[PDB]
C-alpha cells in the first residue's frame, strides 16, 4: 500500500536506527499498517522465503517485497465479514427471526445513512429471495451482497 505511511510507520519501529526491525515484530508492523494476519500466516509468509527464513531482522525493502508477493492473502484479512453487517438487522429483529420485511429493508436502505434510491433498491431486489409474507432472510441477503 501507500509507501509513505508504510515507511513512516517503519521508522517508529526501527529504534536502533539500523534500517531493520526484529523479525518478531513483523506481525505488529503488518497490523499497524492495516492488515490483520494470524501468527500462522505471518510465519508462513516468512518461511516461504529461504532468504528471509533464518534472518534475524528485516529491512524495509525486504518487508515491502514480502507484502507485494503476498498481497492478495494479506488484503483478504481485511475483508468485510457477514457478521460485521448482521448487527444493523439484529438490533431491530427483537425475536431473532432472522428475517426482515421488504418494506423495512427498503426503508432502512433509502431513508437512513448514505441513502440509496428506490431505483437502486429495485435493481438489488432482482437478486434477492422475497417470501410470500414479504420477508427476506437477512444473513443470506448480506452473504450474497458480499460474495465475489
Amino acid at each position: 500500500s501507500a509507501t509513505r505511511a508504510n515507511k513512516d510507520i517503519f521508522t517508529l519501529f526501527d529504534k536502533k536506527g539500523q534500517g531493520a526491525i526484529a523479525k518478531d515484530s513483523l506481525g505488529d508492523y503488518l497490523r499497524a499498517i492495516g492488515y490483520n494476519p494470524t501468527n500462522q500466516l505471518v510465519q508462513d509468509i516468512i518461511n516461504a522465503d529461504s532468504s528471509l527464513r533464518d534472518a534475524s531482522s528485516l529491512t524495509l525493502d525486504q518487508i515491502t517485497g514480502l507484502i507485494e508477493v503476498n498481497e492478495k492473502e494479506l488484503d483478504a484479512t481485511t475483508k468485510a465479514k457477514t457478521e460485521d453487517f448482521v448487527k444493523a438487522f439484529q438490533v431491530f429483529d427483537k425475536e431473532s427471526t432472522g428475517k426482515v420485511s421488504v418494506g423495512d429493508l427498503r426503508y432502512m436502505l433509502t431513508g437512513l445513512g448514505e441513502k440509496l434510491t428506490d431505483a437502486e433498491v429495485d435493481e438489488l431486489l432482482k437478486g434477492v429471495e422475497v417470501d410470500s409474507n414479504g420477508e427476506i432472510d437477512y444473513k443470506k441477503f448480506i452473504e450474497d451482497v458480499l460474495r465475489q
Binding site: 468485510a80 460485521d84 453487517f85 448487527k87 444493523a88 438490533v91 432502512m108 436502505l109 437512513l112 445513512g113 448514505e114 441513502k115 440509496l116 437502486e120 435493481e123 438489488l124 448480506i142 451482497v145 458480499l146 465475489q148
Partner: peptide, 25 residues
Amino acid sequence: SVLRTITNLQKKIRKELKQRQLKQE
C-alpha cells in the same frame, strides 16, 4: 455504530451495483 454499519452496507451495495453494470456494457 448502527448508522455507520448501515452506511458501510450501502457502500458495498453501490459497488455491487456498478459491477453488475460493467457486465452489461
